């Protein structure tokens, strides 16, 4: 077993600490990479940062992760440090890539591009979770506000960049114009799936190993479905 109670406790609180990362700076990835393709960059260009179209996508899509991630951690560790565990990942994930890359590579106004706020929701989730630690309950309520909160949440970072000027007999939003200035291009390809359903998968997926025991507990996909509030968190568009 473990030797002295000062190692047995050591090579624990350390493997445990060093452990916590493995999860985060790894799930994060598999998450962002997703939230990207899913939330077609309504979390990218302020000019795509609108009212209907937007806080209707990120809201939903922004969960089959922030969700299982929760059901995950909270489950086997009744550690209400999950729903939020996810988020940060995306934020510190994008927020990173946002700077240096877009900014230090083909410099883009940290204004035109910049992720959407989520930290808030996560909380009003990981919490309506903590208290009342049952599924359904955390699903209905929780998922609900999780979306209503969205926009209202982002008001700060967003609000201001919507004042308007008159550019040549026409009207636009600080936003809009920021999009007019500093230009780019299209989408613009696709195939983007070999690398995914290949090796990166069953060459990492198998674990398993032949026997069950798993993170297929993501039967949280459910969690997401009950979102139908996020589709509500829409009609907060006059």
């Amino acid at each position: 077993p473990f030797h002295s109670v000062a190692e047995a406790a050591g090579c624990v609180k350390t493997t445990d600490w060093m452990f916590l990362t493995l999860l985060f700076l790894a799930v994060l990835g598999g998450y962002h990479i997703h939230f990207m393709l899913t939330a077609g960059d309504w979390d990218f260009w302020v000019d795509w940062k609108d009212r209907r179209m937007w806080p209707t996508v990120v809201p939903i899509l922004g969960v089959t992760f922030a969700a299982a991630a929760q059901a995950f951690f909270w489950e086997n560790f009744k550690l209400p440090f999950g729903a939020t565990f996810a988020v940060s990942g995306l934020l510190i994930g994008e927020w990173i890539n946002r700077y240096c890359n877009f900014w230090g590579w083909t410099y883009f106004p940290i204004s035109l591009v910049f992720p959407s706020a989520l930290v808030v929701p996560a909380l009003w989730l990981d919490i309506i979770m903590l208290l009342s630690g049952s599924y359904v309950i955390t699903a209905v309520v929780g998922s609900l506000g999780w979306g209503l909160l969205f926009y209202p949440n982002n008001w700060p970072a967003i609000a201001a960049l919507h004042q308007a000027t008159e550019q040549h007999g026409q009207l636009m939003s600080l936003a809009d114009l920021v999009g007019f200035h500093f230009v780019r291009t299209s989408m613009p390809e696709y195939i983007r799936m070999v690398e995914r359903g290949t090796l990166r998968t069953f060459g990492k997926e198998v674990v398993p190993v032949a026997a069950f025991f798993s993170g297929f507990v993501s039967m949280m996909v459910y969690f997401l479905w009950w979102f139908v509030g996020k589709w509500y968190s829409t009609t907060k568009v006059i």
Partner: protein, 159 residues
């Protein structure tokens, strides 16, 4: 006895490698590798291609060999102190594998999204496009094939 940072070579040997790669792509790709028909591309850029796949095959198989014939063999029956010691290691790889991913998911995965929004795409062989679809993923794809390849042959359960 119960190991320290075998992650030395790990995190270190990576964060710098990868980091740097971001520097090198600052120059050439953005002052040479800005057009596939432009030679400064196929020498001081497209170079890191028949330079990456080669490795990411010998490397893929690398761990395959070493990490194999270097298994307890007569595993299963093993030092009950060694098990929760051979994990200390296992649960070390998945930590490198960890950050390892981050690059192929939160970097050259979204960096290729700023690139899309620059050039009117040459080939699927642009910079970010070269260090992602071809680098980053395969880049640590190995890590994984080892941090389980190790764990299956150097640990009981995984049999």
């Amino acid at each position: 006895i119960v190991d320290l940072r075998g992650m030395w070579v790990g995190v270190a040997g990576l964060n710098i490698f990868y980091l740097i790669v971001r520097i090198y792509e600052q120059i050439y790709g953005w002052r040479a590798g800005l057009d596939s028909f432009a030679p400064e591309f196929q020498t001081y850029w497209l170079s890191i291609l028949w330079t990456e796949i080669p490795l990411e095959l010998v490397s893929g198989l690398a761990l395959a060999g070493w990490l194999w014939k270097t298994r307890d063999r007569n595993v299963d029956a093993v030092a009950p102190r060694e098990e929760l010691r051979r994990h200390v290691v296992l649960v070390e790889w998945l930590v490198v594998y960890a950050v390892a991913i981050y690059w192929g998911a939160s970097f050259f995965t979204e960096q290729d999204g700023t690139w899309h929004m620059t050039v009117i795409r040459d080939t699927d062989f642009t910079p970010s496009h070269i260090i992602e679809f071809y680098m980053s993923y395969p880049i640590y794809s190995i890590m994984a094939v080892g941090a389980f390849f190790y764990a299956k042959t150097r640990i009981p359960y995984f049999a």
